[PDB]
Write an enzyme that holds these catalytic residues in place. Structure first.
Site, mmCIF file in Angstrom:
data_model
loop_
_atom_site.group_PDB
_atom_site.id
_atom_site.type_symbol
_atom_site.label_atom_id
_atom_site.label_comp_id
_atom_site.label_asym_id
_atom_site.label_seq_id
_atom_site.Cartn_x
_atom_site.Cartn_y
_atom_site.Cartn_z
ATOM 1 N N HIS A 114 22.819 75.976 61.964
ATOM 2 C CA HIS A 114 22.954 77.063 60.955
ATOM 3 C C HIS A 114 21.562 77.393 60.400
ATOM 4 C CE1 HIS A 114 27.337 75.500 60.515
ATOM 5 N NE2 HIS A 114 27.039 75.872 61.770
ATOM 6 N N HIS A 117 31.060 83.339 63.449
ATOM 7 C CA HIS A 117 30.476 81.983 63.326
ATOM 8 C C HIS A 117 30.010 81.447 64.689
ATOM 9 C CE1 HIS A 117 29.216 78.434 61.371
ATOM 10 N NE2 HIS A 117 29.666 77.801 62.447
ATOM 11 N N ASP A 159 26.195 80.243 65.493
ATOM 12 C CA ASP A 159 25.919 78.942 66.153
ATOM 13 C C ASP A 159 25.067 79.168 67.395
ATOM 14 O OD1 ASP A 159 27.562 77.265 64.528
ATOM 15 O OD2 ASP A 159 29.254 77.419 65.952
ATOM 16 N N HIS A 180 27.936 73.927 71.813
ATOM 17 C CA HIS A 180 26.544 73.422 71.699
ATOM 18 C C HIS A 180 26.140 72.814 73.036
ATOM 19 C CE1 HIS A 180 26.760 74.584 67.655
ATOM 20 N NE2 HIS A 180 27.810 73.755 67.447
HETATM 21 C C1 LIG Z 1 34.114 73.434 67.247
HETATM 22 S S1 LIG Z 1 32.908 74.537 66.808
HETATM 23 O O1 LIG Z 1 33.435 75.432 65.817
HETATM 24 O O2 LIG Z 1 32.426 75.306 67.933
HETATM 25 C C2 LIG Z 1 31.570 73.761 66.186
HETATM 26 C C3 LIG Z 1 30.794 74.469 65.040
HETATM 27 O O3 LIG Z 1 30.605 75.882 65.209
HETATM 28 C C4 LIG Z 1 29.472 73.783 64.612
HETATM 29 N N1 LIG Z 1 28.244 74.610 64.471
HETATM 30 C C5 LIG Z 1 29.831 73.487 63.209
HETATM 31 O O4 LIG Z 1 29.722 74.391 62.400
HETATM 32 N N2 LIG Z 1 30.386 72.333 62.911
HETATM 33 C C6 LIG Z 1 30.648 71.204 63.812
HETATM 34 C C7 LIG Z 1 32.120 70.739 63.721
HETATM 35 C C8 LIG Z 1 32.703 70.628 62.301
HETATM 36 C C9 LIG Z 1 34.224 70.428 62.278
HETATM 37 C C10 LIG Z 1 34.866 70.312 60.914
HETATM 38 C C11 LIG Z 1 34.896 69.089 60.252
HETATM 39 C C12 LIG Z 1 35.506 68.988 59.007
HETATM 40 C C13 LIG Z 1 36.091 70.107 58.423
HETATM 41 C C14 LIG Z 1 36.668 70.009 57.278
HETATM 42 C C15 LIG Z 1 37.260 69.903 56.261
HETATM 43 C C16 LIG Z 1 37.958 69.771 55.189
HETATM 44 C C17 LIG Z 1 38.166 70.854 54.342
HETATM 45 C C18 LIG Z 1 38.933 70.699 53.191
HETATM 46 C C19 LIG Z 1 39.495 69.463 52.887
HETATM 47 C C20 LIG Z 1 40.330 69.291 51.638
HETATM 48 O O5 LIG Z 1 40.184 67.953 51.148
HETATM 49 C C21 LIG Z 1 39.290 68.383 53.738
HETATM 50 C C22 LIG Z 1 38.525 68.538 54.888
HETATM 51 C C23 LIG Z 1 36.076 71.324 59.092
HETATM 52 C C24 LIG Z 1 35.466 71.427 60.337
HETATM 53 C C25 LIG Z 1 32.342 71.924 61.584
HETATM 54 C C26 LIG Z 1 30.830 72.145 61.554
HETATM 55 ZN ZN LIG Z 2 28.491 76.203 63.126
#
Ligand SMILES: CS(=O)(=O)C[C@H](O)[C@@H](N)C(=O)N1CCC(Cc2ccc(C#Cc3ccc(CO)cc3)cc2)CC1
Ligand SMILES: [Zn+2]
Length: 295
Positions: free
Chosen positions: A78, A233, A237, A260
């Protein structure tokens, strides 16, 4: 000429690691010409610096991670997307922990902090990687492609058999990175998040920094920033992953269910096929096929 850019002032911000849950202090500093983006773990003695380059990418299982020995910097994509979008060539990014802070899950907080500090044009030509042959990588039904194009454009397509559903194209000839891409937040499904928490990961996860999705719907009460926020998004990425080339792109990128891992496979194949790209500068910004906002 299109000149190299750095920061005018240092930027301090604090946030949470998405997986660690740790508070992390972030300092962005001006850097000399041809530094690129260099990440520094200032919590260690000595400090450990990892240039944000394709060759230093370690893990791509959940985000883009830089590695040097046993030292990591997680979730660079990001912040790198922000730097690319604003045309920042040279910056030191200091962190107090192994993970860039997630902020709101988008690049918006970073483009605001950077533009608050301001940009400084530097007295060298900005280097661009120009795509001159098509470069495609596939793994199963996933695809990532660079195509020659006199400008910079990014298209993406994802395919989730899902009720809250996607494709989008963005050309930087008419699209504002800031207004149309920067604000697109990270997303995750309940099923996956509870499994990651079960693994003692996504420990920093919250509706404050991610779109949380059911089998049916967005659980965030305040909703989406864009009707196509999910695919926007993925474009955010992809721009961050492409910036690991270390220079802005003259070309087109097409992702089909890319992530990624495959993006990094595309960058390594491109770098290896030297007939497919060249480094160009523009002595006359009026004849260049891209342009950036005033500093
Ligand atoms: C799979 S992907 O989208 O291609 C990967 C993604 O773009 C990558 N750059 C990225 O942004 N990421 C890598 C993967 C990651 C996955 C992810 C992990 C945790 C959460 C969360 C949450 C959460 C929200 C509210 C509560 C209430 O208590 C509890 C938990 C949401 C998403 C998100 C960040
Ligand atoms: Zn992302």
């Amino acid at each position: 000429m299109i000149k190299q850019r750095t920061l005018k002032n240092i930027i301090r911000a604090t946030g949470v690691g998405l997986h660690s849950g740790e508070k992390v202090y972030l300092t962005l500093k001006p850097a000399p010409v041809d530094t690129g983006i260099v990440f520094s773990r200032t919590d260690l003695d000595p400090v450990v610096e990892i240039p944000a380059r394709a060759e230093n990418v370690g893990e791509t299982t959940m985000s883009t991670t830089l590695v040097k020995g046993d030292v990591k910097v997680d979730t660079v994509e990001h912040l790198l997307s922000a730097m690319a979008g604003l045309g920042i060539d040279n910056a030191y990014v200091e962190l107090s922990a192994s993970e860039v802070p997630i902020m709101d899950g988008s690049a918006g907080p970073f483009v605001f902090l950077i533009q608050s500090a301001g940009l400084q044009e530097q007295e060298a030509a900005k280097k661009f990687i120009r795509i001159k042959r098509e470069v495609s990588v596939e793994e199963g039904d996933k695809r990532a492609v660079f195509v020659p194009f006199d400008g910079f454009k990014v298209s993406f397509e994802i395919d989730f058999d899902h009720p809250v559903f996607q494709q989008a194209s963005v050309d930087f000839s008419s699209t504002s990175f800031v207004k149309e891409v920067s604000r697109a937040r990270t997303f995750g499904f309940m099923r996956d998040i509870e499994y990651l928490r079960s693994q003692n990961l996504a420990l920093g996860g919250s509706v404050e920094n991610a779109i949380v999705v059911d089998e049916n719907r967005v659980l965030n009460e305040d909703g989406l920033r864009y009707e196509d926020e999910f695919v926007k998004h993925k474009i955010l990425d992809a721009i961050g992953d492409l910036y690991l080339l270390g220079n802005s792109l003259i070309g087109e990128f097409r992702g089909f269910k890319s992530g990624h891992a495959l993006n990094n496979q595309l960058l390594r194949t491109l770098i290896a096929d030297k007939d497919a790209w060249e480094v160009v500068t523009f002595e006359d910004a009026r004849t260049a096929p891209i342009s950036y906002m005033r500093p």
